[PDB]
Amino acid sequence: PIFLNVLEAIEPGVVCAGHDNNQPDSFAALLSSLNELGERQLVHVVKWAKALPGFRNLHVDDQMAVIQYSWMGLMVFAMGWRSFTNVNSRMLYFAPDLVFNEYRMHKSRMYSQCVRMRHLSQEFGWLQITPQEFLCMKALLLFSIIPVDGLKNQKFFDELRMNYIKELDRIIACKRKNPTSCSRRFYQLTKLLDSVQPIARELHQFAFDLLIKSHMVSVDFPEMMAEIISVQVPKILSGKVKPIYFHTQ
């Protein structure tokens, strides 16, 4: 079980936001905490990606680009998994010290996005997604958004993405002998994977908008987050970089 051994081994451990839960649930306090958590996670996201099987095969430039493009989707998906495994998707578990209940969802000003993320988290339960499927799908999300015009080394990327799909295929078939059973599961998993993209798109828009009006005085947005939102996110929003949907949207 080489492939799965690796996925489990490189999976980041718990990361706290450093949020003081005694403070009032203001937009400012929740924003400060979310961003701090964001910057902290990004640190782990980069090391995670670079330790992924075959990732080093990508051109240096494509490595960081791909990481930065899928960043948001990766955080949505993983966050959704933590909510499911920790609080049975009852609340949004961004971190042990930063759990969103109804009031915080409203206070953050991303209530609808949170509700959509809550749905996503519940799909992990309805579909009975295994830790194995979760890990392989999360890795695939890393390879699910690229420039329309292509990456420095597009063929290496396509090769890699294909191999990860093949792995997701092995997972599904490991305990399934009748093809139909397998096809049904693949359908379910690819539909779930797709559903992450629309949510990340809205979060991308929300982040961009906030960065702009925030720049006015408080450019308090962390460094790495600030770089991705000002340099990479617009490429997505303007349509130069797009997600790779499995099914027609």
Ligand X SMILES: CC(=O)O[C@]1(C(C)=O)CC[C@H]2[C@@H]3C=C(Cl)C4=CC(=O)[C@@H]5C[C@@H]5[C@]4(C)[C@H]3CC[C@@]21C
Q: Contact positions toward ligand X, by CB under 6 A?
A: 31, 34-35, 37-38, 41, 75-76, 79, 94, 108, 110, 203, 206-207, 210
Q: Which residues have C-beta within 8 Å of that of residue 123, sequence separation ≥ 6?
A: 129, 192, 195
In the complex, least distance from residue 144 CB atom to ligand X, rounded to whole angstroms: 16
Q: Which is nearer to ligand X, 185 or 204 (CB)?
A: 204
C-alpha span between 152 and 237 (Å, rounded): 21
In the complex, least distance from residue 78 CB atom to ligand X, rounded to whole angstroms: 7
Lookup: tokens for 182 = 């397998």
Could you tell me which residues are beta bridge partners of residue 241? 147
Which residue is nearest to ligand X, using beta carbons?
Answer: 207
Q: Which is nearer to ligand X, 172 or 236 (CB)?
A: 236
Q: Which is nearer to ligand X, 108 or 144 (CB)?
A: 108
Q: Which residues have C-beta within 8 Å of that of residue 112, sequence separation ≥ 6?
A: 202
Q: Which is nearer to ligand X, 160 or 232 (CB)?
A: 232
- Per DSSP, which regions of the chain are E strands? 92-95, 98-100, 145-147, 241-243
Q: Are strands 241-243 and 98-100 parallel, antiparallel or unpaired?
A: unpaired
Give the HSE-up count for residue 237: Cα atoms under 13 Å, Cβ half-sphere.
15
C-alpha span between 120 and 28 (Å, rounded): 26
**8 A C-beta contact, residue 213 and residue 120:** no
In the complex, least distance from residue 203 CB atom to ligand X, rounded to whole angstroms: 4
In the complex, least distance from residue 170 CB atom to ligand X, rounded to whole angstroms: 29
C-alpha span between 1 and 124 (Å, rounded): 23
In the complex, least distance from residue 37 CB atom to ligand X, rounded to whole angstroms: 4
**8 A C-beta contact, residue 33 and residue 17:** yes
In the complex, least distance from residue 35 CB atom to ligand X, rounded to whole angstroms: 5
Q: Which is nearer to ligand X, 174 or 231 (CB)?
A: 231
Q: Which is nearer to ligand X, 178 or 238 (CB)?
A: 238
